[PDB]
Write a protein that binds this ligand. Structure first.
Ligand code: UDP
Ligand code: UDP
Lengths: 461, 456
């Protein structure tokens, strides 16, 4: 009787791709590690023309008796024309899977199922859960900063898209974020009149219908933001900080063979401690244009810093002689896909030019690597802004860069690199302190484990 | 039977030169016509009287008078070049008025004012002297200016809300894209106001003289008359060109000769000349690197005039030029002598009007890269109206993002493609250019009519 009574089940419905999947799987593992009678079923969605399928997930899970996965049938992808807004495209694709989600839940339903854990983009699934009397929990792969922005959309109408006019000078007061936020660091979606704003609006609208909001962040980083949100609107469900949630091993990717993988780390072994700058801009596989790539190459070479540069640019694009020089001196290396967590863990890495995706930020924080910000899409500009202006752990190259921005010149890049690699940088002390705080969050008795315990109690009670 | 005209060109040798060629043209056609040119020194820059006597050729019928210099306007106004210049010239009214009164006689028959000096028409009015507008630009620019009257004084063109907005301007056949309008039209810091204030006086002049020719824009002139009877007579007296080029800085021609010798060594019509005006502001480092790569990869031979520091160029670029000799870079260039050179087969130009006229005169095709003033408009018409040029960009302006090497290379190859459609129109435009200024040609007939109107 006691055993039956203790068994509980959660159904996870994460968004496609690493960046959304990694933390969600690590979360499923954290949960099961803290309740032997907690079982989880992960619905695996197939995104049109995209990797990170079963292979990746099973690799991450690496055997877990309390976690099983079920693939959802493939459905017709939405029209490409809707890509005028990635966010709206994603929302449309996910809502198209509602019928299959309902059908799959009906097939594995039992009376021990106590809830759904949904990604930000899958909140429409809340209604499906209600059909079965199953409550839903929001699992946010971003931070409390992004949550604050989404929760603020309630005070406005779905037709009032953010002004794309003078965002070069428009400070906004967003409850949750202490600093006035420059309008030019808001996500592209907020200004998108072709579905972007509508998508953000429609999703944020469902946030308050969840039984709880779980965030991949930690108390020492955003407790004041969480407190600020409550002090503003008590209608917000309970917020649980259970991070950092990271995949510290990394999983195999086709764009990186074992030989390539091994050589990168061995090359790093040969470099002086904290002398190498790592450059990586996410998992989307879309590089900067030719001119911009040339400017980065020249800036890197002119700075004299050693580097590991991950990019998918064609060889013909590089400045004449650059690649020859690079492999002649061996002062730098280029790869198509990097074993990021192993790189950030290496003693040779002294800096990280990042696109500021949240997982990449958490990883750099966990390893105490300083970041030179170069945001591009999603909420990366907001993350860059806070890293530089709020937490003071990063240096700004650009905090408002986005698709359509002008090319960043080699001279400006060279300047950022020198400041980043400066041993006497002021952010150095802050980064060291942030490393300690992120590590302590997840040890026994740390803020995140105390939080996960209470979350599990709330879920299964 | 002497008559005297007072010329007041805009500050700077660029304008002093254009005004002098015009003074020469008029005096050459009326032995009893004398011209007095008021020289105004641009805030700061020297150019005192070096180029003056340089191209003077001791013309008995032409005299130069230097007006005292005055405190230039505050640097803060530089947010709008046009408004800055306008303010400067207006502060010169007292001196202009005093100088006219000192040389006034029953023989003075009129004032010839540059575009930026048209507000001086009030000074001429005080002495009962008629004012003529002298445009160093073309009838397309005249058309745009005259159309400003259909707007308000604070209507700075929909607040740069230009992207697809098309405009119908009398005098210009094609609907004009809002993105090829001069920076001043969108400038809310005084640019639009300056243009509006000057244009507002165009119809008050006794006649409008333009550096252009009938075979090029007669239809635009006809459209204008047909659209507004208040427009005074328009006289096309160009091309007005200095076929000798600014001699000074004259120091026996060290760098000069270096340039011409290099060109003498290249195959005929194999060289692309790149030159972007006389204002001196160089494209930024990134853009300079993209032009360098584009040129090298394209395979064309080239003579590139620029003011970039040597350290900015792509690594290996400078060495390559010196070793393979396919191209070379220089600073200030003897542009007319270069365009006249048989080695030149193409010209990447900022599309300033004098550069356009000089290129048409020597039959050299242009690949357009406008930057400021009415250059985008000039570029637009060169490509879409006259077909004598190829467009790299027609809407480029300060603030535009870098034009990549790939795009430049494509432009260079099309420009140097002997089967391009521009080459045929170019030869014809060359003939029409030359024919405009010979006896019986349209511009000399116009000159006679103008002198008759002036001294009549
Ligand atoms: O070349 C790469 C690029 C990215 N990543 C990993 O992919 C995830 C990227 O997530 P993030 O939110 O930082 O950016 P996103 O790709 O979602 O825009 C992180 O775990 C990175 O460590 C990696 O391992 N190698
Ligand atoms: O390096 C140079 C650049 C320009 N010019 C001359 O300077 C004048 C430029 O006039 P334009 O209206 O074409 O451009 P602007 O300099 O007024 O913007 C023309 O006579 C060009 O031939 C020259 O001789 N050498």
């Amino acid at each position: 009787m006691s055993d039956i009574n203790k068994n509980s089940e959660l159904i996870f419905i994460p968004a496609p791709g690493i960046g959304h999947l990694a933390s969600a799987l690590e979360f499923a593992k954290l949960l099961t590690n803290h309740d032997k009678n907690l079982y989880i079923t992960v619905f695996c969605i197939k995104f049109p023309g995209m990797p990170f399928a079963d292979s990746y997930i099973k690799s991450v899970l690496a055997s877990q008796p309390q976690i099983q996965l079920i693939d959802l049938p493939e459905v017709e992808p939405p029209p490409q024309e809707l890509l005028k807004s990635p966010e709206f495209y994603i929302l449309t694709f996910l809502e198209s899977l509602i019928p299959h989600v309902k059908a799959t839940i009906k097939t594995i339903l039992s009376n021990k199922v106590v809830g759904l854990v949904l990604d930000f983009f899958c909140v429409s699934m809340i209604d499906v859960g209600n059909e079965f009397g199953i409550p839903s929990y929001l699992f946010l792969t971003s931070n409390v900063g992004f949550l604050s922005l989404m929760l603020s959309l309630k005070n406005r109408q779905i037709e009032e898209v953010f002004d794309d006019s003078d965002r070069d000078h428009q400070l906004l007061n967003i409850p949750g974020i202490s600093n006035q936020v420059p309008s030019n660091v808001l996500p592209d979606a907020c200004f998108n009149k072709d579905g972007g704003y509508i998508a953000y609006y429609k999703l944020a609208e469902r946030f308050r219908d969840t039984k709880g909001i779980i965030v991949n962040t930690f108390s020492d980083l955003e407790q004041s933001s969480i407190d600020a949100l409550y002090d503003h609107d008590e209608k917000i469900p309970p917020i649980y900080a259970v991070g950092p949630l990271l995949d510290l091993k990394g999983q195999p990717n086709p764009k990186l063979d074992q030989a390539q993988h091994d050589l990168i780390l061995k090359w790093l072994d040969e470099q002086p401690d904290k002398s190498v700058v790592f450059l990586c801009f996410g998992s989307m596989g879309v590089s900067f244009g030719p001119s911009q790539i040339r400017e980065i190459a020249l800036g890197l070479k002119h700075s004299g810093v050693r580097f590991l540069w991950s990019n998918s640019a064609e060889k013909k694009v590089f400045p004449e002689g650059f690649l020859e020089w690079m492999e002649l001196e061996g002062k730098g290396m280029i790869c198509g896909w990097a074993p990021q967590v192993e790189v950030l863990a290496h003693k040779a890495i002294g800096g990280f030019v990042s696109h500021c995706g949240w997982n990449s930020i958490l990883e750099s924080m966990w390893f105490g690597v300083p970041i030179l910000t170069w945001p591009i899409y999603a909420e990366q500009q907001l993350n860059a802004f806070r890293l530089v202006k709020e937490w003071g752990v990063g240096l700004g190259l650009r905090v408002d860069y986005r698709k359509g921005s002008d090319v960043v010149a080699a001279e400006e890049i060279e300047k950022g690199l020198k400041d980043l690699m400066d041993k006497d940088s002021i952010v150095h002390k802050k980064v060291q302190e942030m490393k300690e705080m992120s590590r302590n969050a997840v040890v026994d008795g740390g803020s995140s484990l105390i939080s996960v315990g209470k979350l599990i109690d709330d879920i299964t009670g």
